[PDB]
Scaffold this active site. Structure first.
Site, PDB file in Angstrom:
ATOM      1  N   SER A  61       0.854  -1.194   0.000  1.00 15.79           N
ATOM      2  CA  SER A  61       0.000   0.000   0.000  1.00 15.79           C
ATOM      3  C   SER A  61       0.890   1.245   0.000  1.00 15.79           C
ATOM      4  CB  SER A  61      -0.974  -0.116   1.164  1.00 15.79           C
ATOM      5  OG  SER A  61      -1.456   1.155   1.559  1.00 15.79           O
TER       6      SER A  61
ATOM      7  N   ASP B  74      -8.191  -2.758  -7.039  1.00 12.17           N
ATOM      8  CA  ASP B  74      -8.158  -3.689  -5.918  1.00 12.17           C
ATOM      9  C   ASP B  74      -9.077  -3.246  -4.785  1.00 12.17           C
ATOM     10  OD1 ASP B  74      -6.829  -1.637  -4.554  1.00 12.17           O
ATOM     11  OD2 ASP B  74      -4.898  -2.659  -4.500  1.00 12.17           O
TER      12      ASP B  74
ATOM     13  N   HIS C 289      -7.195  -4.879  -1.711  1.00  6.71           N
ATOM     14  CA  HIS C 289      -6.050  -4.078  -1.282  1.00  6.71           C
ATOM     15  C   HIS C 289      -5.402  -4.626  -0.011  1.00  6.71           C
ATOM     16  CE1 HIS C 289      -3.602  -0.529  -1.483  1.00  6.71           C
ATOM     17  NE2 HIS C 289      -4.035  -0.046  -0.333  1.00  6.71           N
TER      18      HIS C 289
HETATM   19 ZN   LIG Z   1      -3.225   1.485   0.793  1.00  3.80          ZN
END
Ligand SMILES: [Zn+2]
Ligand SMILES: *[C@@H]1O[C@H](CO)[C@@H](O)[C@H](O)[C@H]1NC(C)=O
Ligand SMILES: *[C@@H]1O[C@H](CO)[C@@H](O)[C@H](O)[C@H]1NC(C)=O
Ligand SMILES: *[C@@H]1O[C@H](CO)[C@@H](O)[C@H](O)[C@H]1NC(C)=O
Ligand SMILES: *[C@@H]1O[C@H](CO)[C@@H](O)[C@H](O)[C@H]1NC(C)=O
Ligand SMILES: [Cl-]
Ligand SMILES: [Cl-]
Ligand SMILES: [Zn+2]
Ligand SMILES: [Zn+2]
Ligand SMILES: [Zn+2]
Ligand SMILES: [Zn+2]
Ligand SMILES: [Zn+2]
Ligand SMILES: [Zn+2]
Ligand SMILES: [Zn+2]
Lengths: 376, 376
Positions: A162, A324, A356
């Site tokens: 991320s 995602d 994600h």
């Molecule tokens: Zn993220």
């Protein structure tokens, strides 16, 4: 096997705080604490009766004179577990099912022969800030990598999730090529938000409590606005179209050309200054300069714009595109652009249906990582 | 990968000739030929019995009225292989070991994905002349670069060796900045004689057959004097000292302030006119205005002056300084001066122990070029 450093995303490692505040917003709030307490993730602190105390402790104060953020007066926030993995395997010290984060991946690595805090180490950071205010973190990261190279006889593989991909890219773009050529074996990128995410507009406008639903949306908006990392991930011009409408009202349409007016219309002009501070941190077209594996999720309905009938205090209607669930699919194009710009291999790996957050514990993700670290 | 144009130095590409001469200097010399023949490099033409025929065909006639050179009457000389690489990979059509020139670099490029005559092309020229008489060549070079930009989707990298760096610098100084910003990615400079070379005095005074020893020194001197490019590379005041003695006799010492008297004392006053024609072609302090990589050899004994006991018909005693064997090390100072003068980066790369000609096929040279073209 190569030494491994794990870089988390936002909300992706624990934070601790100690208080010696001059004043409190409510007479129920603690003014001074014995030692440090876990401020994230700690469900006890988020109950409605004391949720205002938590906001007043985890928010950041923006300073226009210095163009930087400060903790509230008398509040210290530290990042525990640097060079270890506990603050990053679970987000809650009680280790709930909800807060399980890097644990599944760490457990796999140990299963393959790794040892926590030895040849696999976490690099947590204060994810409320953008890289320009984590200078010491990057120094500590460089020294840890050099140390691991010496102790375990080889260059290091960086595994980022991320927002941590943007922290790692900032780090790598600023190290000399000779250093990266010696100390970095590979960069495994998991769900990287190259060029920002559209949901950042909704976060700033009305808050987003999706990952911690016990917090009311307008309460979390106070903390999310104060975090520089929110404005840092607003959509960028090298990924999105300048004509793309991310926020639609009966009156106004907000594109990425309208961030100044957007921040004024939501009553948060400090956000525009933080966007100025952070818009140029990551160079738009500079590759990381190391062997790269870009793993990205597809097939997950992902917010690409928002319609407000009552702006900005009411939840908007969400319009969904591909990605995602958090990172729009067009962000993966940036990884493909770096192929022509660097000699080291750039591998792209689509993960159909991988969300994600959930890609961190996904067996297909771990199977790809295993081939990178252990070989064929 | 970015398109590449290769610019050779002097003697660095093939030349062809066709004869329809009104007279010959000897009854053994051919007056008229069926088609073109290779006049450089062709060992068959250099045997002592016919070496005078070759001199009479490859020399240039200087015209004081027009201040330009002409081929001898009825002799045409053309430059084959423009936009291709064959005339520049090998200097002899038989492709001898001696005449292997750009072949090793071209072979590397093809190994990295390039295709001869497509996204890697040669820019050969009549290296007997200075740029003021190759106007059409520079027009052809600009059109080829614009064509390569369109066909291969990016600006072009220029790779020049030896005298070709001065041709390329002349070209770049005269193109508008906006054109270079669009069409030129980088300029890789290999062994550039910025500011002239001291061995030019020895070439004019007594000839230098080092690269083709089958030709007697006094015979090759006839051709080397007639070549404008020889006088063009006489030492320049912005590199050398005006008090530096390049030629020493029992009677007279020649500095760069004495070129007119030098040309008179060697019985070749036309050289002084060619120096006038060429002294101002390249601006002394104007940078190329593109990203520049200056690769220069050091640690190779390089002639810096000459002592004649019998001037100018006997080989002199050579005094050696630092450089690449041909280009004195102080020529690299000119590249260092351009840093403050242009926005684009100016990179300097010393090549310890790399000889002038040999750097073209040297693995370290090719490794540097690979990073420029392919990235980190
Ligand atoms: Zn993220
Ligand atoms: C902002 O920073 C300036 C300079 O460090 C300092 O003088 C001032 O006290 C700070 N503002 C606040 C509200 O602390
Ligand atoms: C794990 O990722 C794979 C590949 O993207 C995907 O097919 C699968 O649905 C994911 N697992 C879960 C539980 O979502
Ligand atoms: C020199 O050039 C002039 C003018 O172009 C021309 O008239 C003359 O014939 C040339 N001289 C020779 C020897 O060709
Ligand atoms: C090639 O260049 C390298 C670096 O300049 C130099 O050390 C080496 O001697 C050269 N190789 C030959 C064969 O001269
Ligand atoms: Cl690689
Ligand atoms: Cl540059
Ligand atoms: Zn829409
Ligand atoms: Zn829509
Ligand atoms: Zn939409
Ligand atoms: Zn040369
Ligand atoms: Zn001397
Ligand atoms: Zn001496
Ligand atoms: Zn000397």
């Amino acid at each position: 096997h190569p030494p491994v450093v794990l870089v988390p995303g936002d909300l992706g490692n624990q934070l601790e705080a100690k208080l010696d505040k001059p004043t409190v917003v409510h007479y129920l709030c603690s003014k001074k604490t014995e030692s440090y307490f876990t401020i994230w993730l700690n469900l006890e602190l988020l109950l409605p009766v004391i949720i205002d105390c938590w906001i007043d402790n985890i928010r950041l104060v923006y300073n226009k004179t210095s163009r930087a953020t400060q903790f509230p007066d008398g509040v210290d926030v530290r990042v525990p577990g640097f060079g270890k993995t506990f603050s990053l395997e679970f987000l809650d010290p009680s280790k709930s099912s909800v807060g399980s984060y890097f644990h599944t991946m760490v457990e796999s690595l140990v299963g393959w022969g790794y040892t926590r805090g030895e040849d696999v180490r976490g690099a947590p950071y204060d994810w409320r800030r953008a890289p320009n205010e984590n200078g010491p973190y990057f120094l500590a990261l460089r020294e840890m990598i050099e140390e691991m190279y010496q102790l375990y006889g080889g260059p290091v593989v960086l595994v980022a999730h991320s927002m941590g991909n943007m922290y790692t890219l900032y780090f790598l773009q600023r190290q000399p090529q000779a250093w990266k050529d010696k100390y970095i074996r590979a960069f495994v990128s998991l769900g990287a938000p190259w060029g920002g995410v559209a949901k950042t507009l909704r976060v700033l406008a009305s808050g987003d409590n999706n990952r911690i639903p016990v917090i009311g949306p307008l309460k979390i908006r106070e903390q999310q606005r104060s975090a520089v990392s929110t404005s840092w991930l607003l959509p960028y011009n090298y990924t999105w179209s300048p004509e793309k409408v991310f926020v639609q009202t009966p009156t106004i349409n907000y594109t990425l050309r309208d961030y100044r007016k957007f921040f004024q219309d939501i009553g948060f002009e400090d956000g525009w200054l933080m966007r100025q501070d952070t818009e140029g941190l990551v160079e738009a077209t500079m590759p990381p300069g190391v062997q790269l594996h870009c793993l990205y999720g597809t097939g997950v309905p992902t917010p690409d714009s928002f319609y407000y009938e009552s702006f900005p205090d009411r939840d908007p209607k969400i319009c969904f595109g591909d990605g995602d669930g958090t990172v729009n699919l067009k962000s993966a194009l940036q990884c493909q652009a770096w192929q022509s710009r660097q000699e080291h291999q750039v591998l792209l790996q689509e993960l159909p249906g991988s969300e994600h957050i959930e890609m961190l514990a996904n067996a297909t993700t771990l199977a790809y990582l295993k081939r990178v670290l252990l070989g064929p």
